[PDB]
Amino acid sequence: MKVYITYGTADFLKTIVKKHPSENILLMQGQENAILIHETSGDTVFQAPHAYEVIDQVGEIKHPGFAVLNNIAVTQEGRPLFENKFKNRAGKVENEPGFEAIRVLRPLDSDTYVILTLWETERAFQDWQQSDSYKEAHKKIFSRPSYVTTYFAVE
Numbered sequence: 316m317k318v319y320i321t322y323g324t325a326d327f328l329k330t331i332v333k334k335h336p337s338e339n340i341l342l343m344q345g346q347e348n349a350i351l352i353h354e355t356s357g358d359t360v361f362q363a364p365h366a367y368e369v370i371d372q373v374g375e376i377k378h379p380g381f382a383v384l385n386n387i388a389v390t391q392e393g394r395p396l397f398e399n400k401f402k403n404r405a406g407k408v409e410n411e412p413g414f415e416a417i418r419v420l421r422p423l424d425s426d427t428y429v430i431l432t433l434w435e436t437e438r439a440f441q442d443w444q445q446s447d448s449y450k451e452a453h454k455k456i457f458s459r460p461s462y463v464t465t466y467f468a469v470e
């Protein structure tokens with residue numbers, strides 16, 4: 316239900332994973348830094364996590380080769396609409412090849428939601444992005460502009 320995320324250099328972030336083998340913590344390397352994603356039903360184990368309620372979920376988190384995060388700033392009153400602009404999501408992404416999982420993460424310490432989709436490869440995402448099922452989700456209340464970050468399985 317709950318996702319915790321912390322960012323930084325990957326060698327360091329590994330020492331955190333090895334401390335909590337009991338917990339399902341994914342590590343991927345992005346441009347600016349590496350990320351730890353931690354899906355659990357209870358407690359964080361990061362110092363200073365970014366914390367999220369999972370409000371939509373598909374597939375499981377277990378070793379994706381590629382991860383894409385869309386980082387969206389929603390105003391405080393904006394949330395209820397946005398929230399149910401995603402309920403409205405068709406989830407045409409899920410019935411697509413290479414797609415391992417999606418999570419729509421409601422933030423608890425910021426205004427920035429995160430739509431996290433997990434893939435087997437970059438190309439799997441790169442495929443879907445050019446597909447029509449990208450443009451039936453985008454055809455024809457935000458604090459500041461959204462951005463996308465991307466991460467690779469560990470190198």
Ligand code: HEM
Nearest residue numbers: 385400401403404405406407408409430451452453461463
């Ligand atoms: C690489 C870029 C993006 C990806 C991968 C992405 C992914 C998604 C997905 C998977 C859904 C809904 C699930 C579905 O219909 O299959 C969705 C919906 C949405 N996205 Fe994005 N998105 C992107 C860019 C953006 C941008 C730039 C904005 C706003 C400026 C945005 C705002 C929304 C909103 C409001 C919805 C809910 C309406 C809908 O169902 O399409 N997204 N996005």
